[PDB]
Design a protein around this nucleic acid. Structure first.
Ligand SMILES: [Mg+2]
Ligand SMILES: [Mg+2]
Ligand SMILES: [Mg+2]
Ligand SMILES: [Mg+2]
Ligand SMILES: [Mg+2]
Ligand SMILES: [Mg+2]
Ligand SMILES: [Mg+2]
Ligand SMILES: [Mg+2]
Ligand SMILES: [Mg+2]
Ligand SMILES: [Mg+2]
Ligand SMILES: [Mg+2]
Ligand SMILES: [Mg+2]
Ligand SMILES: [Mg+2]
Ligand SMILES: [Mg+2]
Ligand SMILES: [Mg+2]
Ligand SMILES: [Mg+2]
Ligand SMILES: [Mg+2]
Ligand SMILES: [Mg+2]
Ligand SMILES: [Mg+2]
Ligand SMILES: [Mg+2]
Ligand SMILES: [Mg+2]
Ligand SMILES: [Mg+2]
Ligand SMILES: [Mg+2]
Ligand SMILES: [Mg+2]
Ligand SMILES: [Mg+2]
Lengths: 135, 139, 131
RNA sequence: UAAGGAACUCGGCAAAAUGACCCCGUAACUUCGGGAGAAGGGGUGCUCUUUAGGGUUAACGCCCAGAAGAGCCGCAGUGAAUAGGCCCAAGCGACUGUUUAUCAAAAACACAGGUCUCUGCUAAACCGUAAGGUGAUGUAUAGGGGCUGACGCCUGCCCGGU
RNA sequence: CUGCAUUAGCUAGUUGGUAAGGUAACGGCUUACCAAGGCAACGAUGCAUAGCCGACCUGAGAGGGUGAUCGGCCACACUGGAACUGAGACACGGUCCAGACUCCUACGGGAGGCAGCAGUAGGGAAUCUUCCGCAAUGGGCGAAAGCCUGACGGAGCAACGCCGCGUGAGUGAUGAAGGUCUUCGGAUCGUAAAACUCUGUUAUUAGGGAAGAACAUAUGUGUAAGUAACUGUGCACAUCUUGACGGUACCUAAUCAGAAAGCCACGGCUAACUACGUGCCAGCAGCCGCGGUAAUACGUAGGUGGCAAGCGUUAUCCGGAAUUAUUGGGCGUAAAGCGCGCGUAGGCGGUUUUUUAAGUCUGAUGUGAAAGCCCACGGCUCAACCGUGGAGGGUCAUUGGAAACUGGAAAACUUGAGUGCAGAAGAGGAAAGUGGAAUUCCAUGUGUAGCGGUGAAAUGCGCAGAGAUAUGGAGGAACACCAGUGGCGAAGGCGACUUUCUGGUCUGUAACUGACGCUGAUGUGCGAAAGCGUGGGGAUCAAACAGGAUUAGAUACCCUGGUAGUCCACGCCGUAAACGAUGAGUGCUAAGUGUUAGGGGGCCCCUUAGUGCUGCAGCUAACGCAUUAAGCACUCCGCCUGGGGAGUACGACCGCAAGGUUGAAACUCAAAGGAAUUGACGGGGACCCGCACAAGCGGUGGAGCAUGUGGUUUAAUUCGAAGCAACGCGA
RNA sequence: GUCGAAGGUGGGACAAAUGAUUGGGGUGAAGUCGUAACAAGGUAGCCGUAUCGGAAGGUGCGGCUGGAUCACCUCCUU
RNA sequence: AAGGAGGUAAAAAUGG
């Protein structure tokens, strides 16, 4: 563009989207509205718990939960690790990070937080699955 | 149903307040059940949830998860053919179903002789039987 | 139509230098003549001739090639332009090629090189870079 | 006509309510005309003071007609009488009109518009036994008949039967 | 000092004046009168969001993001209004009124405002003690002691951050046991360990123990102003006393290696590899991906790597990203030149002279608080930290200087741009008129059984006389040859001829004006075909449609018909692969050779404007472009920022309608794309060859029989071979 | 008595949530029907427009080459 | 002699 064209219409940068929109929103109950706040995790209640089939070429029964967050947004969260103790009405902590195999699963459920238990029999990378030191 | 979160929170607080009052979810029925020391106990707890926690709830007799079984034995066959269109799929099996001894559970036996059914598909036959029996056949 | 005679002169010089031409005739102006004289003094061109004819006259430049036919002028760049004019202070005067090139400037004290601008402690409109 | 205010009834039938003039203000939708007096509000008597004007006259005078302010009285000032209730939706008919004089006024008829069809002029069609007429002192941009019925978007398949 | 035009009009005390009132004060601050002004594309108004700054994070910088702690300024104190007192308030812990909410009551009536410090409930992923003291600094009152001070000084809690020190050190092969792997030799954990020696940072115990403290007041004197003289007051020198922290920091003495290491990673990016279990399951994952029996990618074990009282994960910002490109990118084919004109504002602008000093450059002064960042020094044992100086930071203001460039003013020039004069070609446009060929239809003569059509057919037309042939008539549409990388036009487009009106372009000349120019948002027009409305027209062709054929089917291609439409007038629509997929203007940079319309000099040379081909330098990812640039430069405009969603939704404007213009997001993928390369393939092609055709002899197919094969039958007719390349084949 | 918060009444503007029902869009495993495009893709493809059809699509009109191809003439380049 | 541009015939079953 000419300098005159830049002066008339300055350059405009591309806007960046969040990978975890459900964590960027809080809810004010008194005013019954949403509010913009960046959060690293959110509490939620597991509306459903079950398994999903990944997209090709992968094949598996990946464990996930449909969770209502404290801000009233309903999301799918993956359950990492081997074995979990989650059912409907379980209260779980949700963090960002999607599962590439699972199409609509954009969050993870923290292990070893609120109701969710650590992975039983985990000994390497235990902090990633909320397992205490066996000793 | 919009008050289910309030109901869960009230149940948690109430279980912390009273050791003898319990609440648990039943997987089979997908119902939440509340156990107490009597009718008066549960009635007071329901009323306290309704008023103090402002969560109106209705209570009833817990649903009973029933089971099915075969009373008579019989040899049976199943044959599925889907060759009419595009890719063609053929399956055929001959299975004797027998009333098992009560409490013994499902038992799959593979009396295949001569490889009439390739050994690759026998586990698939077992898995199909398991799924189909998980789904009820009478009710 | 024509909008930057200095640009045009520099582009004529660049094209002639690329084709390895010996002489170069362009329409004349005071600013072009001072630029050409600065180039001659600095050694980028061989000679400058002015034809005081009608129609503003003509400037006849004679370019300079070194041994092995090497080109003395590596490149000429217009800095200040009609669409955006560039000025610099004495303390902000740019060095072309770490000093191995000249920046032709226009100053209250006449059009001079960046070295003279820094020496006399003046700034002005940065007409061009040449190296 | 207390209180109530459609609880009446098939149905707000009847009644009640609105009603004049001036000022403010006025939605969807629309064929841009409308809808509209939409809706919803404010004012209205009398006295005095000051004061822009218009018609007719030399002028006086007569007539018309405003504006501002300060006061007075009543429960109440278009103080009586006469003078729209309004709004939101749906079916039907485009509309103004016409009709069962005397139980039906309507969604029926008509309509402007559309189309089909007959008719070359002593036209066809109609009245009459005929003569003689209407058509028409017209002539296919005309005239008769059938069907449809503003406008907008459209109007599919079948010619075996009559 | 901020985002939006999918917000273009806003304003009526509004803008100005006069008079008055009012205020600490000027002022439409308010009122009365007069006028119709004021703001706005240099973004008014409206909507949304937001305390601002010093600073903080990031970045090489330019920039981008942020506005915690600390300092300044502003605003607010349950919500709204008001005033009182006062120097100061329209007042957080004041008053009044109204409102919402809550509490006490004897039911008559009363009370309250933690966004002060703690703390409670609630919300949340998440943020602390209902602590000690006014000893220090500061503040209010008091003459003062002193009182008050949840400011403040401290302590408590939290790895929340930064900084510092630990968890031991020396010797230690005799490579001890034991784990893991193994090629069963051994390798590795490993100087690691054991053992001997050493230290006590830390830790436990017992002693000593700061500074922060200046003071004020009180008591003594000395001195200074005043006094007639004291007491007093200012100042100076002395003395008693003053610590929440706290018996804390710190120091000393003794005892013990004894109490004090975890987290992640090890396929590539990326430092670190092996064994077992699993077997597309369980699982992993930032991307590419890994996992179906040999998994360095899943889980465990050994080992290794990086860090270490922390280590990992998630969230957010900057970076890498030149991926909005001023620095510092693009638009022939990858995303991107508006379909094309005419033209407004704006942007930019040829040569010379004089002048001004708005921009531009230069010197001085003031300021840009403190803290912070950077540089230096000093103090905590170091460091963090603290302190002190310097430097830096303005698009800052006032003032003094310079005149080249940009800007302003004045005066000249002809090169650009127009005009005159002499010439040239043209399917440029609009309206009327004339004409030949051909198609269709109608009438008539001759004439017989087909015509037509296709790969082959059938439908259809024709025994009523079709088709063919001859003559005449009716009507509509298009203009055979010329015709050409030819011409004209901004583009769309324009092809028979004639007349009238009319536009543009090119060549030469150098009178004439003297920069009058270029681009061009918004606007205003034209704009292929189809399509729409009204009225005509209707030959041909032909969506829809009917029949025939092909086909597994055939809503098609093919055949026979056939309506809208195709044509005209006037309106509407406003879109095309509207293309050179290449915006306009200007100048510069090798050549060769055609063609169109001119001009000058001797078939030749030179030259102007087009239109083509080939080709240097240069450019390009390559293909290619290359004086008709896609090269080198300057000006202006339009446009792009991964593929879908989508030219969609919503809003707006336009349209009779069809639709057009403007134009997102959620969500989803890790691609989507361009040019070129090698193969393979094609119901692509060219050429060459072969008993492949052709030339010729003899056969098979016909008869009987032998044999093999399919089929059927049977108890079995064993199995294998199935176009050529199965069938006197395994045999 | 003026001004005057709150309140009341009224017709409009704007925003958000929600709504029987409805529309296309994206993704998904070996689903069903045909085979539009890529070679001349077996009817060259594509663009605009109109109409028709289960669907891709077909057809008509104009346009483009970003189209392969055997025989012919017409030029232009080395 | 070999390459670039324009016009222009004649042919055609269906599925791999
Ligand atoms: Mg009554
Ligand atoms: Mg009733
Ligand atoms: Mg009535
Ligand atoms: Mg009617
Ligand atoms: Mg009657
Ligand atoms: Mg009646
Ligand atoms: Mg009717
Ligand atoms: Mg705010
Ligand atoms: Mg950068
Ligand atoms: Mg106060
Ligand atoms: Mg308070
Ligand atoms: Mg508090
Ligand atoms: Mg909570
Ligand atoms: Mg950047
Ligand atoms: Mg493109
Ligand atoms: Mg163009
Ligand atoms: Mg277009
Ligand atoms: Mg400072
Ligand atoms: Mg047309
Ligand atoms: Mg046809
Ligand atoms: Mg284009
Ligand atoms: Mg030429
Ligand atoms: Mg095909
Ligand atoms: Mg095709
Ligand atoms: Mg069709």
């Amino acid at each position: 563009p000419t300098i005159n064209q830049l002066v008339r219409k300055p350059r405009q940068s591309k806007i960046k989207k969040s990978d975890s929109p459900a964590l960027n929103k809080g809810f004010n109950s008194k005013k019954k509205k949403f509010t913009d706040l960046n959060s690293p995790q959110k509490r939620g209640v597991c509306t459903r718990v079950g398994t999903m089939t990944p997209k090709k070429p992968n094949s598996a029964l990946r464990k996930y939960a449909r969770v209502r967050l404290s801000n009233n947004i309903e999301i799918n969260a993956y359950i990492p690790g081997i074995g979990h103790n989650l059912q409907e009405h379980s209260v779980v902590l949700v963090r960002g990070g999607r599962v590439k195999d699972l199409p609509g699963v954009r969050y993870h459920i923290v292990r070893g937080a609120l109701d969710t238990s650590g992975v039983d029999g985990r000994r390497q990378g235990r902090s990633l699955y909320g397992t205490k030191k066996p000793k | 149903k919009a008050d289910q979160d309030k109901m869960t929170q009230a149940l948690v607080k109430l279980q912390e307040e009273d050791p003898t009052f319990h609440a648990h979810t039943d997987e089979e029925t997908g119902q939440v059940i509340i156990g107490g020391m009597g009718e008066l106990h549960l009635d007071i707890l329901v009323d306290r949830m309704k008023k103090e926690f402002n969560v109106e709830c209705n209570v009833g007799a817990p649903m009973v998860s029933y089971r099915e079984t075969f009373k008579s034995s019989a040899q049976v066959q199943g044959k599925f053919s889907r060759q009419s269109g595009g890719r063609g799929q053929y399956g055929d099996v001959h299975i004797e179903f027998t009333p098992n001894e009560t409490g013994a559970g499902f038992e799959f036996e593979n009396a295949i002789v001569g490889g009439v059914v390739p050994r690759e598909y026998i586990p698939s036959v077992e898995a199909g039987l398991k799924d189909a029996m998980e789904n009820g056949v009478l009710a | 139509t024509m909008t930057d005679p200095i640009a045009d002169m520099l582009t004529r010089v660049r094209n002639a230098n690329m084709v390895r031409h010996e002489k170069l005739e362009l329409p004349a102006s005071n600013i072009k003549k001072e630029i050409a004289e600065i180039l001659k003094s600095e050694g980028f061109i061989k000679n400058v001739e002015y034809v005081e004819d009608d129609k503003q006259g003509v400037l006849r430049l004679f370019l300079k090639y070194g041994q092995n036919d090497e080109r003395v002028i590596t490149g000429l760049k217009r800095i200040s332009k009609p669409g955006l004019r560039v000025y610099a202070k004495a303390s902000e005067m740019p060095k072309v090629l770490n000093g191995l090139g000249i920046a032709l400037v226009s100053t209250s004290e006449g059009v001079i090189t960046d070295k003279e601008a820094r020496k006399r402690n003046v700034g002005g409109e940065i007409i061009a870079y040449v190296w």
